[PDB]
Amino acid sequence: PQITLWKRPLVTIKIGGQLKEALLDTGADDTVLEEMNLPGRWKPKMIGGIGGFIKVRQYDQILIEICGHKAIGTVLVGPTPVNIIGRNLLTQIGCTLNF
Amino acid sequence: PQITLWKRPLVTIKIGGQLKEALLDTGADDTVLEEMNLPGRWKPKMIGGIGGFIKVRQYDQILIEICGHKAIGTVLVGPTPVNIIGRNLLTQIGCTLNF
Ligand SMILES: CCC(CC)CN(C[C@@H](O)[C@H](Cc1cc(F)cc(F)c1)NC(=O)O[C@H]1CO[C@H]2OCC[C@H]21)S(=O)(=O)c1ccc([C@H](C)O)cc1
């Protein structure tokens, strides 16, 4: 689908057997999700934004269905205000910007 | 133009007679730029993202030529790590997400 930007580009995702809403964020290099249990091992990581830095758990090879499009990649879980789908996953579903 | 997301969607912008590179950020509702000298009056405002909040200077009806497309709107000026073109201006140049 084509999405206009007059409202927040939120989409439904299926991850870890849970349904959530996430923001397709072209300004984010990485996918960051609010707290959950992504099954398997992780490695501590620190990520930064406009306001400073937050501590997240880095989970690799996580399956995520973004509006029915399947993708596996690194997913960081931590105190983000909002779920954000980053460019690591957006490339996999073939998402593009169009003026 | 159509832009794939395998790299950061960086574009050149012209603002206040200054040439800069900015990030097409669908996750940003408003435009926020690193410190610069933008002519006119301003009003303090606080905006938040990952890691917390920053205090920015709000400017209204500012002209910006983004990748050859002109747009007028509010631009927030403050300690952002990266220049970001938000949805307030992305809609004027006709930007859409397509996957
Ligand atoms: C969840 C945050 C999101 C929603 C709550 C809001 N943000 C948008 C998002 O696109 C940022 C862009 C970004 C890119 C960057 F290189 C440096 C930055 F500081 C910010 N990306 C981000 O934080 O990404 C994280 C994960 O990926 C990594 O790479 C990059 C940083 C790391 S915002 O910029 O705070 C923002 C902008 C405008 C407004 C106006 C006033 O409405 C409000 C808030």
- Name the residue facing A48 among B29, B81, B96 (closest C-beta): B81
CA gap B64, B85 in Å, rounded: 10
Q: Which of A18, A28, A98 is closest to A64 using CA atoms?
A: A18
In CATH, what number is assigned to the domain containing residue B43?
A: 2.40.70.10
Interchain proximity B2–A91, CB inside 8 Å: no
3-class secondary structure per residue, B16-35: CCEEEEEEECCCCCCEEECC
By DSSP bridging, strand A18-24 and strand A84-85 are parallel
Confirm whether A30 is a catalytic residue: no
- Which secondary structure element, helix H or strand E, spans residue B71, and what is its range? strand B69-77
Q: Which structural domain range is residue B54 located in?
A: 1-99
**Ligand 1 atom closest to B47 (CA):** 41
From the alpha carbon of A32, which atom of ligand 1 is closest? Answer: 26
- Name chain A contacts of B98, Cβ cutoff 8 Å: 1-3, 95-98
Please name the residue of chain B whose CA is at the shortest distance from the CA of residue A69. B99
Looking at residue A99, the DSSP 8-state letter turns out to be: -
- Which residue shows structure tokens 């579903």? A93
For this entry, resolution in Å reads 1.8
Task: Report d(CA B71, CA B14) in Å as an integer.
Answer: 10
Method: X-ray
Tell me the two tokens of residue B55.
């205090």
In angstroms and rounded to an integer, the radius of gyration of the C-alpha atoms of chain A is: 13
Which residue, among B54, B69, B52, has the nearest Cα to B15 in the 3D structure?
B69
Q: Tell me if A66 sits within 8 A of A22, measured CB to CB.
A: yes
How many structural domains comprise chain B?
1
Nearest CA in chain A to B66: A99
Asked if B92 contacts A6 with a C-beta cutoff of 8 angstroms, the reply is no
Beta-bridge partner residues of B50: none
Measured between beta carbons, the chain A residues lying within 8 angstroms of B6 are 87, 91
Q: Which residues of A touch B50 (CB under 8 A)?
A: 32, 47-51, 54, 80-81
